[PDB]
């Protein structure tokens, strides 16, 4: 559940 809010799955 927890992660960096700035982390977007589409940006890999």
């Amino acid at each position: 559940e927890r992660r960096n809010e700035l982390q977007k799955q589409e940006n890999r």
Partner: antibody
Framework: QVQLQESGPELKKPGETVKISCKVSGYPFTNYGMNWVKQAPRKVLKWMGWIDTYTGDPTYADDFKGRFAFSLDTSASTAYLQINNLKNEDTATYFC?????WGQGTLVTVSA | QLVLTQSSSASFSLGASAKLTCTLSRQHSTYTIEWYQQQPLKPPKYVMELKKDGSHSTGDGIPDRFSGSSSGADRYLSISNIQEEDEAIYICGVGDTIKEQFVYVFGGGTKVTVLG
């Protein structure tokens, strides 16, 4: 209601060490990681890295290796930033940011 | 390299529409960016998330006159009927993950001046 409250301004001499806090309120602290951002007088925002607010695992940006350390007090919903062996170039406002919420900033002045 | 390109400054008359550009590098051109607003005696404020298809989602306390749009590697912040309170530096940001390693980058920012 969500608020990230940082410690007050700091005046340090070069070579000294500073510890900045960021008190999180209004959401579960361990749900989101905490980013640290530098805004030197130039005003350009610079990402310093982030820390997992459960594990305490930090990730530093390339420009912030060695002298910079991120720590927690999960019980207190507080994130810390410690800069060791201070330099004039460390004179900047430091932010803690969830991303969508930001702290008010902490001015660190490095002067003899 | 994960690079964002913006203008140094721009001016607009009160009531006009301001289009600001944030440009993703050749690679990463399909990436989602974030827009931040920074006013003189205040910390930065989250404005929105803007995806490659123009899809956007604003933050709290962000008026309806703020919207986004995209082309290819270009991400646009559109401010409709620009107000004098919208005078600020608008900064864009982008994240990237490699092998479970998160890295975030900010652009140089665009200083916005509202005339009239």
């Amino acid at each position: 209601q969500v608020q990230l409250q940082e410690s007050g301004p700091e005046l340090k001499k070069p070579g000294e060490t500073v510890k900045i806090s960021c008190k999180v309120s209004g959401y579960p602290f361990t749900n989101y990681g905490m980013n640290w951002v530098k805004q030197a007088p130039r005003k350009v925002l610079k990402w310093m890295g982030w820390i997992d607010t459960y594990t305490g695992d930090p990730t530093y940006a390339d420009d912030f290796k060695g002298r910079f350390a991120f720590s927690l007090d999960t019980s207190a919903s507080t994130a810390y930033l410690q800069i060791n062996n201070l330099k004039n170039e460390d004179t900047a406002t430091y932010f803690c940011a969830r991303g969508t919420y930001w702290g008010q900033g902490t001015l660190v002045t490095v002067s003899a | 390299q994960l690079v964002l390109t913006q203008s140094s400054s721009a001016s607009f008359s009160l009531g006009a529409s301001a289009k600001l550009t944030c440009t993703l590098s050749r690679q990463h051109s399909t990436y989602t960016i974030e827009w931040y607003q920074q006013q003189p005696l205040k910390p930065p404020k989250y404005v929105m998330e803007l995806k490659k298809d123009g899809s956007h989602s604003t933050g709290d306390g962000i008026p309806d006159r703020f919207s986004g749009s995209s082309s290819g590697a270009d991400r646009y912040l559109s401010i409709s009927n620009i107000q004098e309170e919208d005078e600020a530096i608008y900064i864009c940001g982008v994240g990237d993950t490699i092998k479970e390693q998160f890295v975030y980058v900010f652009g140089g920012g665009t200083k916005v001046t509202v005339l009239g």
